[PDB]
Amino acid sequence: AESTLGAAAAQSGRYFGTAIASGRLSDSTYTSIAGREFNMVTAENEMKIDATEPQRGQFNFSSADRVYNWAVQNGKQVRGHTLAWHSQQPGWMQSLSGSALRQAMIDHINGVMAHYKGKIVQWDVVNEAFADGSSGARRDSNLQRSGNDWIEVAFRTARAADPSAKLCYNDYNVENWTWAKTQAMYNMVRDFKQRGVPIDCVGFQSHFNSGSPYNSNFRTTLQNFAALGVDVAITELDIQGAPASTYANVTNDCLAVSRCLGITVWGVRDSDSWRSEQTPLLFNNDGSKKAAYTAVLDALNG
């Protein structure tokens, strides 16, 4: 047994990560608890398209590198998040469509991945490409309107840019095996594997709440994606109300699936959360451990 989340995960070769925000890196409580507890970091915003390429062709890695360097100085690996996405696009990219957008998408992938080549264990190459609801359709965006192949092109680009990185597709509302969105993502990954599209991993954001609740069948989802020949990762876990039982359940689903790489929670203290009103994380506002912390640690320790 181990006394911290990352170390406990590492006993089985897994990680326990968090999202890190550069604007919080002057908060001594934040940096010390995050430093102690996690062995994997995702930048909460700093590696997104707008942050890294604020004008076309003009990269700015200052905030991204602050997060990256904090991670490596503190003994963590890094998940890169995210290269191609409808959200948080800079204005210049929102104005592009079709072939011009395709070139810009490719250029963005190449430039960001080159900056971090060999340094990033997993990239969320593509984020949130499916619609919610019963259709299983692709989400509408400039990217999708450029062609159904946008996603595969992004992956092929990423494979060439950094052959050392695990290339992940990341999404939410894809945890429940019975949901249409989950099935759409399953069919995509299966199709990609069958056609030689390079994809190594699927990220389950795992933003569980009353409208999109955890189900025990998450384990079935994880198993079934693993059986396609991809790793699986829980990438942005948070749970409305931070119920200890649900947190243990998710943890045990990862531990039960050999291809589950690890778990990232989407922030440190409840007050750091993008959904702080839902108190959905493992640490209280004052940095103390919640009941859910103990349930996760105990699960990681068997």
Ligand SMILES: O[C@@H]1[C@@H](O)[C@H](O[C@@H]2CNC[C@H](O)[C@H]2O)OC[C@H]1O
């Ligand atoms: O600061 C928030 C940030 O937490 C949020 O992160 C996204 C949550 N939804 C899924 C995405 O994959 C995450 O990047 O993005 C919006 C920011 O304002």
